[model samples]
Target: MIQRTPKIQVYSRHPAENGKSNFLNCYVSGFHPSDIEVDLLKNGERIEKVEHSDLSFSKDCSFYLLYYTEFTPTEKDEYACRVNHVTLSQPKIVKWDRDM
Candidate 1:
């Protein structure tokens, strides 16, 4: 069995209110081996105690699976997602940019 690398993407939704309680989501999927970590970061700081949801495939065990987490952003700040897996030699990072 060969292991594959994941494709990471970060996305966000603007606050319904005055752009205050904005939320962001990070997606890590299309990789092999389910043992992976997805960290949501704020300005490069690791957020502790995070929970994420996963989209699993029951039809095909080898099918691609995705993990995602959401968070509320701080006013006027940059956020990123850090990924760790055996497929990656070093940790992979994907940053988010919300330009209104």
Candidate 2:
């Protein structure tokens, strides 16, 4: 069996600001054997109405997946993307960068 760990990124579609509607995006890529799980969470709770893009492969044959959800940020909210892949020894948790 072949396995490759995925790279995960979490970001908002727009520059983040409290009380503004934005899209939360989680992009997972550079992996093989496409069995994986992705979640959009707010303060450790699962976010509803999340959507996914079609799975795609790169020239190197590694697979990629994308997930997104509409969201509104708040001063006290913590947003994150959680991924589970067979190649990973533990879950990959990437947090949204609001100040970047």
**Candidate lDDT values, in order:** 0.69, 0.83
lDDT tens digits, residue span 1-100, model 1: 7677888878876547655544566767667776777788887898774555655643434334343445666667788888888889999998876642
Q: What clash count does candidate 2 reach?
A: 0
Query: Which runs of model 1 end up more than 4 angstroms from their true locations?
Result: 14-21, 49-51, 58-75
Q: Could you give candidate 2's per-residue lDDT for residues 1-100 as a string of tens digits?
A: 6778999888877545744567788989898888888888899987877855658998888998888877778879999999988988898888888752
Listed per model in order, the count of residue pairs whose N, CA or C atoms clash below 3 Å is: 0, 0
Show model 2 residue runs off by greater than 4 Å: 15-21
Q: Each candidate's root-mean-square deviation in Å?
A: 3.7, 3.5
- The true-versus-predicted C-alpha distance at residue 23 of model 2, in Å, is 0.5
Candidate 2 weakest lDDT stretch, 10 residues: 12-21
Score residue 40 of candidate 1 by CA lDDT.
82
